[PDB]
Design a protein around this ligand. Sequence first.
Ligand code: FE
Lengths: 272, 315, 189, 49, 49
Amino acid sequence: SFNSRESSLADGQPVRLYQFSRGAIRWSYNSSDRDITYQNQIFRTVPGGITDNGIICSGDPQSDQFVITAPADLDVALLYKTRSPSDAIDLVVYDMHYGDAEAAVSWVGQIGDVDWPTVDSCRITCVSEDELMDQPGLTDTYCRTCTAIVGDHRCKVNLVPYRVTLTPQSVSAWVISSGVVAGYADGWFTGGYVEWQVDGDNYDRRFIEQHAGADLHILGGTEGIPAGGQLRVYPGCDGLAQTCDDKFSNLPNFRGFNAMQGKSPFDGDQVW
Amino acid sequence: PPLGFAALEERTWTVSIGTDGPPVVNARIVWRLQGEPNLVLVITGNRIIAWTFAPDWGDSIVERLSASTNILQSESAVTQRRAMRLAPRREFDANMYAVDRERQLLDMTLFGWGARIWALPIWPDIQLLHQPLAAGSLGIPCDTAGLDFRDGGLAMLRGEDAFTYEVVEVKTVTASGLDLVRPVQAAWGTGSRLYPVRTAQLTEQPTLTRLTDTAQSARVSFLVMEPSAWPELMPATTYRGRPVLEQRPDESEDLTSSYQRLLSTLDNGSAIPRVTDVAGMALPVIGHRWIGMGRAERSAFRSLVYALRGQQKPL
Amino acid sequence: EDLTSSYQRLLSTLDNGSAIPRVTDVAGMALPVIGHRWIGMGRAERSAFRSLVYALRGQQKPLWVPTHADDLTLVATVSQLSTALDVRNIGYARFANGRPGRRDIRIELYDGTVYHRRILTSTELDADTERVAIDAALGRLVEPTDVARICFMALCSAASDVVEIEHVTDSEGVATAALTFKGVRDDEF
Amino acid sequence: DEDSGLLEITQEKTGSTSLAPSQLIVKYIDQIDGAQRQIIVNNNAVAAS
Amino acid sequence: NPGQPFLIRSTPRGIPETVVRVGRIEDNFLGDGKITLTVVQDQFNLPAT
Ligand SMILES: [Fe+3]
């Protein structure tokens, strides 16, 4: 009846539904003045209303953004206030008419940017998957180092055995200290990242600038790190062939070119 | 708080909830004891102040029902309608006075509460009790025919003065009384006013005009932030599967008619214009007026207005 | 000419969509607006008014603008050393409990002597009477029968810079003008 | 259609015919040798005008 | 959707049934209710000879 209602000249009762999902956690909002139950999901009513600006599909990712307006107290947007969540918040938009149990999917995407122009409002800019095609695609260089992030699909190195679970001893503005890591050689954890559970099955990740003794340096500060929460810390690969094989014994998968050639052409001037 | 509990002893405290405090009740009381996980008693709710000023009835009170319906028509005289708001926003306009002990109270309330939710009684729905209400009684037997009473709503008894009042929660409507969940703590005899209560907010702060040392007339306007459910009924007569308006309009004020047309594209230059009929069809415009002189007619008109949903539903 | 008052607020960001609006108090403070009119009937009064207008410099220079209402009325005599003024319960404690605006008092005794006081905190005592406090002393024992009005004071400044001085007869004659004052947070805070 | 879901059509863009090219040169690379090659496409009707 | 061809007819404008291909899309489901489309005449075809 959704299509029939759209074609109807007197039963038009538009209502737009938004679904923000991050793994196992979902946030449901509706633009009407009362909650709507759809597919066993109830959508909350935001005091003040939630509205968008329209959907544009012109083939230009930079121009085809989707804008959401909502109060500054919106739960899903509140997360971005202090620090952007590590994972992207997928957004799905449905369209349905009051009194009908059928809805149609209109827009699908993820959060691109969030800002709070006024205390009584917040503007969210949503981007589609098409915008991820503007970055280069070379991803190849003939250099000495590995040119591969430890654990990627190219290194084929399993980090689960190297996982270390610990409770930090003391947390400071920029340094998190723990005695368990003090037993490892300096720089063992350099290049690794720290992941811990925020809510449900979602974890927030932070990279490590440097590891020295019992003190760990966290890039961008330690804000948001629970002082007593359980933390998982993985090591980091420098990328050198000696580092790759002595520590991880992954030399066969070494993607770097240590000593094949640095400059030698076959159309130079004098070989000697 | 530190006080031992005797064995097989139940100590029932008296949780007294006051009337002064922050608007949003976000309380987390923790009952912490040794060798037992924290058992936090969470109290949640909101604090509101009721509007207890009687506006004089010399000038008619205007009730406004507004809804949103953006309609776009093509070159031909065809319209598609997209009624937006299902529950129309209700606005009330009235004038009031304050002379003895009400002027200062009004000034203090306006300065303090300001732009915050009220509990506006429905003045047009005034009602007088037929029998005295005993203190502590559960249920108020009163007429509920064509009144703005809804299950789980609010009611507000009133007396001669502003102070004499009390708000109760109505559970359901039995067509003869108002089921209540909390007993009334004070008895008012015949003559006390009964008012339906709906949440309202001051759309614009009234401009107070001083009449004398202690006297101020105000033009208060209120908007209700709750849906106003009401049955939607069309006229009994039907023609070609559509309603027919059989009501005869009042002729007290002379009314005219016009033939609105999509007669744009006049294309006036400098020599002579030329108008082209895009559709060549005339849609007449008609005005209507009526007089209620009764509760039933007013209820029927309200149901008709709700059924119309603005311009969406034709007839 | 009858005059009224209003409570202007920075109540923007109403944020009305389609379902329901929601208004948020950015500051939660009310600044009253008061109108004023006067008659000269003399050269000295007109010169004084012109000097006052020049001193105001528009909205720049503020000055207290007492009202002339009768909001508070005594119900029990107060000793000179007592600071527990008793007034009829008008919901003051629930609404006014110490904050900028509506926390100043002018006794304005019958004889003509006026005492300026400063409210400190109001406590509810009964459904009909209260025990609002003051800053320091009263000056003497005053019975309820010896009070005219209270006329809450409030710091205010002009709301419109333009001032119209309507000359009627002559410099030594009658004149009319209108002034409007609006509350403003000033005086070191 | 106007009665079938069309509201208003504003732009017409009649265009022009006296302009536009009469000869088109297409340059392509042959993968057998990798040497630049080109072909010529002609519009006799437009060319005459 | 982009690239989808469809027919348009408008007798008052003197435009007979014409086949056009969708271009830029800008729709407004909530608020104004305006769905505006930019279309071009269907003249795309790749000959096999
Ligand atoms: Fe590696």
